Design a protein around this ligand. Structure first.
Ligand SMILES: *[C@@H]1O[C@H](CO)[C@@H](O[C@@H]2O[C@H](CO)[C@@H](O[C@@H]3O[C@H](CO)[C@@H](O)[C@H](O[C@H]4O[C@H](CO)[C@@H](O)[C@H](O)[C@@H]4O)[C@@H]3O)[C@H](O)[C@H]2NC(C)=O)[C@H](O)[C@H]1NC(C)=O
Ligand SMILES: *[C@@H]1O[C@H](CO)[C@@H](O[C@@H]2O[C@H](CO)[C@@H](O[C@@H]3O[C@H](CO)[C@@H](O)[C@H](O[C@H]4O[C@H](CO)[C@@H](O)[C@H](O)[C@@H]4O)[C@@H]3O)[C@H](O)[C@H]2NC(C)=O)[C@H](O)[C@H]1NC(C)=O
Ligand SMILES: *[C@@H]1O[C@H](CO)[C@@H](O[C@@H]2O[C@H](CO)[C@@H](O)[C@H](O)[C@H]2NC(C)=O)[C@H](O)[C@H]1NC(C)=O
Ligand SMILES: *[C@@H]1O[C@H](CO)[C@@H](O[C@@H]2O[C@H](CO)[C@@H](O)[C@H](O)[C@H]2NC(C)=O)[C@H](O)[C@H]1NC(C)=O
Ligand SMILES: *[C@@H]1O[C@H](CO)[C@@H](O)[C@H](O)[C@H]1NC(C)=O
Ligand SMILES: *[C@@H]1O[C@H](CO)[C@@H](O)[C@H](O)[C@H]1NC(C)=O
Ligand SMILES: *[C@@H]1O[C@H](CO)[C@@H](O)[C@H](O)[C@H]1NC(C)=O
Ligand SMILES: *[C@@H]1O[C@H](CO)[C@@H](O)[C@H](O)[C@H]1NC(C)=O
Lengths: 574, 574
């Protein structure tokens, strides 16, 4: 019933298109549920695209289809806007990134001079790539495989060889290679040879000197695997120990391998770590830190709301992320700034004197360095004509003579309706005796046998007019013309109390007695209370075989179907 | 929208059709508002009429028209029934009565012998009539007029002459006449002559003897004029005094005329009256009573009601009349008796386990000897499929670690819906840790990092099925790792209190201090409270220039957007 903001059900997702692939198209999906159905626009780097006919970019039911994707003119960030007569909404981002691995530079590698017994550096300066590759080293023949012993180390972050000790077998020509691991294809690129030569021998057992070290500060989101690498020059082969300064490591990680690995990281891993190289000739240690961060997550969002013209509203948001997020507001896909009767403050939204214009689709955005999140809601403002169906004025208003009466008149209206009372055809301007409160309730005091008749309440606003009618009748009031008396007796004695009343001739009158505000039962078998002198106006009560519990404050009450009256006395029982 | 019982707006009215008139038709009106429009039937003495084509009785839009009305076959009591697919209603009665005045009997009146100086009786036995007539007497000539002095009296309830004293001028022949006073026509009927003759006489004065007296018991509704007549035989002309035994008469009625009149009667006139004839030779007095009564009137009626299948209902009625009325119930124009799940008792109606069949038009009838009154209402029973629009399950359910959570699931259904919970795709059979109450609320104790996910509630009844979904997430809980200490100081001293807390790394934590559960202000200019050691986990407070009012129980509370914790201490100031 045209009460459908363009709610989202499928927002686009980031893609990594491999280069030199065998595909021809990519799809970015956008799906909205709306009534009437919504229309879609696509933003690329912010500027609204001009989706011409089927030249490259095309629209298929809200999904974006690019043709012949290439990094030259298709890599970017894409957004989808779903618009309706009610309002518009904006979806989350979708990044399209390409993947490739170029060819190694063709110039010859310089020959590194070495002296037998020391350590040497063999870098292999990997070419441009995306994403990170896996590195290996080759010697002499293709394909051989350099052994992965404790004498050599090949880091996976720079790839340089770490030849701890140099001897005769190290003569040859070293080449690097890189392997790209992707979902679709795998590529391997080899490097030109670098012939290493060794000078005269010089061997002495020396203290380790740490060369490959993990950086002091290492940021890592919660859920990622972290690998800290460590290596030192030492003869004989040193041993590497990993420890935590402000804690202890899990037994699954208490290993002496030169690369400490954490498969999953939570907030308990944040702290300081120490890598120590140890041998019979020395020891060298290096410290560093690990910091854990997280993306924002919602804690409290907004929801759909229908209000009425003239009222006020309050809306809120709340997020949670390790670098604290910031919250901002959107109206129909546009930034919302504090103006007029809309007040925004750091994630709370206030509407004062809500109007008809304030209806639409609102959005809440929480952002930090690691990501952004969205939430949507709809505000609808309603105007209503006066209606008395739910709360009509009482049809029958029996009022005792010489008393006060109050008749409220509150129709269901939006905004509030002006209320005017009348009796018959005359219009009531209030006086000392008749009063008309601003709320519309009409109160009459000092009632008599001349106020009976038909009363009408008229409610009007700029939307409509309604009206209701009641009938007022007057009767005589109840009276108590005799009150009982206090007494003191012994347990097991009999006492009598009297109570007389007068009432209107046309109604029924009943007598009820309470003991300390507790109604006294007379139909109880073996009961100690008996009605006596039972007439239309006489309702005496006799206590037979009095007990301790019968002491207290007795209260006689004469009640009709309309009103009541009461009198009090007390009895003590020993 | 087919929610219209045949409400009444014009019910028939009693008529008095004068005989020997010049009219040819009568109309009895019946009007009902209904949607769809209602159909009408007419009852005459109770049997449903067979309204044939236009032979005498005819129907015009719900109104009844009889043709050539005559007392022979048209005088009765008429009722109108308005029927709809929703239900039927029955209107109040309407009595049709004729009015006429026949011709006086043609036989000669007997000659009444009289003895001069006495009193004589001259009745005139009025013929059949409706309604009561006005009586007058004629003597000798037509038209003469006998004087209305104190010597003669002509009562209006029997019409007989009361000649107090008889003398020579009383010789003649007396005739009666009756005049019928109606709205349309006036008719006068004269009677044959009765020749009165007089014998010898005497000469003396005697005591009065009352002859025409008012009856001892006289019933009179509220609003009617009551006339009590009195006369006695007395020479000379006696005087009549009217008094009240248990009260005093109004000055407008304290008159000595031989007919006491009350234009309007209220309940204060009920009692005993005395008429006294007085003269120089004697006095005779006669007593009687006046009893005042009233017709039933409503005090509390029923109204339209929509309920749901499976519930219970209570309805009531109340009337007021001097002869106490009796209340009975009608369903669709038929008497309602206590059967099955409907219980009737002396004006209260109880529905137990309301079904779909109990929908329709109900009516309440209050009756006594002086009249009857009706009231109408409609009962509608609704069945509803489950719906979660008004009360959906919470979308975000942040739960602290190691605590308890409760999630209710109450859809809008009629009757109640069976509720089954599930996590993901598994079905939860409830145990020590997880409990599913009969109301549907699911409670989990001892929450860990294994309970997060998506929870679903399925509600089903014989009308339909619906479901709702929520998301559960777990976070660390707040703590207070340091509590303050009690102290005693003098007015004007400075005191420091400490309070430390721990919380989840991704949320904000704030400290608030209260004095005897009243929040302590820190931004108050010239305030005595200053925040100190303000860190993320340290929120100390210092009292500067302490006053008497600063003594009491301090409470430090560390709170987040989700949960909170608190600790207490006390300070005394002299
Ligand atoms: C106090 O009462 C009413 C509102 O509660 C207010 O308006 C009048 O009465 C009804 C409101 O229900 C208006 O509509 C009428 O409804 C009745 C039955 O529900 C019908 O009989 C009426 O028939 C009219 O049909 C034509 C088109 O509507 C009219 O042109 C024609 O004249 C008939 O009246 C009608 O549907 C109704 O129109 C108004 N006005 C009148 C004059 O009745 C009412 O005026 C309030 N009283 C006062 C003194 O202000
Ligand atoms: C828990 O969720 C729902 C109840 O809330 C329950 O019913 C299923 O989902 C929707 C409920 O809104 C049913 O109606 C669907 O609505 C969505 C969008 O609102 C549409 O995409 C669906 O399209 C259907 O259209 C045809 C005619 O309706 C179908 O024949 C066709 O197969 C499409 O599904 C449809 O209008 C929906 O029918 C049901 N059922 C299913 C299978 O979705 C849902 O089953 C509950 N889940 C569980 C596990 O019990
Ligand atoms: C009715 O009479 C009162 C005086 O008793 C007028 O004054 C109002 O009284 C209400 C009672 O609570 C208060 O709100 C104010 O003292 C008055 N209200 C306003 C709006 O002035 C009142 O104005 C009279 N109503 C009319 C004339 O419609
Ligand atoms: C859930 O476990 C409880 C036991 O703790 C089962 O017993 C019900 O517990 C409620 C709790 O107030 C009580 O009404 C009764 O003791 C039991 N109710 C009924 C209808 O038997 C309960 O049945 C379990 N829920 C299930 C099985 O759905
Ligand atoms: C779009 O954005 C990307 C990344 O910010 C940028 O590389 C590119 O040059 C932009 N413009 C295009 C694709 O036309
Ligand atoms: C109520 O009205 C009557 C007049 O009808 C008057 O005599 C009486 O004093 C009024 N009540 C009060 C409390 O003034
Ligand atoms: C109808 O009722 C009246 C009054 O009770 C009665 O006089 C008459 O005979 C009845 N039958 C008719 C009018 O056919
Ligand atoms: C709460 O659960 C944990 C494990 O999740 C358990 O070790 C602990 O004892 C439980 N609490 C209580 C009070 O048993």
């Amino acid at each position: 019933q045209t009460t459908f903001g363009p709610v989202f059900e499928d927002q686009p997702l980031s893609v990594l298109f491999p280069e030199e692939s065998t595909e021809e198209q990519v799809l970015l999906a956008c799906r909205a549920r709306a009534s009437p159905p919504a229309t879609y626009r696509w933003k690329m780097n912010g500027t609204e695209m001009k989706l011409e006919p089927g030249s490259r970019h095309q629209l298929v039911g809200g999904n974006l289809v690019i043709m012949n994707p290439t990094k030259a003119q298709d890599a970017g960030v894409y957004q989808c806007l779903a618009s309706n007569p009610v309002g518009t909404v904006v979806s989350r981002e979708a990044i399209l990134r390409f993947g490739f691995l170029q060819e190694f530079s063709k110039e010859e590698r310089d020959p590194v001079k070495a002296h037998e017994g020391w350590g040497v550096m063999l870098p292999c300066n990997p070419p441009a790539h995306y994403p990170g590759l896996s590195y290996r080293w080759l010697l002499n023949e293709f394909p051989n495989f350099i052994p992965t012993d404790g004498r050599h180390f090949v880091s996976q972050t720079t790839g340089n060889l770490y030849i701890a000790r140099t001897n005769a077998s190290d003569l040859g020509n070293y080449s690097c290679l890189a392997t790209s691991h992707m979902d679709f294809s795998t590529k391997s690129v080899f490097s030109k040879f670098a012939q290493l030569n060794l000078a005269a021998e010089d061997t002495r057992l020396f203290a380790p000197s740490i060369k490959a070290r993990f950086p002091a500060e290492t940021y890592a989101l919660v859920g990622q695997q972290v690998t800290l690498e460590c290596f030192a020059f030492g003869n004989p082969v040193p041993r590497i120990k990993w420890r935590k300064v402000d804690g202890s490591l899990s037994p699954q990680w208490t290993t002496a391998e030169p690369t400490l690995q954490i498969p999953s990281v939570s907030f308990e891993d944040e702290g300081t770590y120490e890598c120590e190289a140890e041998n019979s000739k020395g020891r060298d240690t290096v410290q560093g830190r690990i910091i854990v961060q997280a993306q924002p997550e919602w804690l409290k969002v907004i929801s759909d709301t229908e209000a009425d013209i003239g009222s006020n509203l309050r809306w809120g948001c709340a997020a949670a992320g390790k670098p604290r997020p910031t919250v901002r507001w959107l109206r129909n896909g546009e930034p919302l700034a504090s103006q007029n009767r809309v007040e925004v403050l750091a994630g709370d939204l206030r509407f004062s004197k809500l109007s008809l214009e304030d209806s639409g689709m609102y959005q809440c955005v929480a952002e930090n360095k690691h990501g952004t999140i969205y939430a949507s809601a709809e505000l609808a403002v309603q105007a209503l004509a006066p209606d008395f169906r739910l709360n009509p004025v009482r049809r029958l208003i029996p009022a005792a003579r010489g008393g006060e009466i109050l008749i409220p008149c509150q129709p269901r209206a939006a905004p509030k309706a002006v209320v005017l009372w009348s009796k018959g055809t005359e219009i009531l301007v209030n006086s000392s005796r008749v009063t008309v409160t601003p709320d519309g309730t009409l109160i009459i005091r000092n009632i008599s046998r001349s106020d009976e008749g038909k009363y009408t309440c008229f409610a009007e606003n700029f939307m409509g007019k309604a009206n209701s009618t009641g009938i007022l009748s007057v009767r005589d009031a109840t009276k108590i013309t005799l009150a009982p008396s206090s007494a003191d007796i012994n347990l097991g004695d009999n006492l009598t109390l009297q109570c007389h009343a007068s009432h209107d001739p046309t109604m029924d009158l009943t007598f009820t007695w309470t003991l300390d505000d507790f109604p006294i039962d007379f139909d109880k078998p073996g009961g100690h209370y008996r009605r006596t002198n039972v007439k239309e106006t006489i309702g005496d009560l006799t206590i037979l075989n009095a007990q301790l519990r019968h002491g207290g404050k007795y209260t006689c009450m004469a009640q009709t179907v309309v009103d009541s009256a009461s009198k009090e006395a007390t009895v003590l029982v020993r």
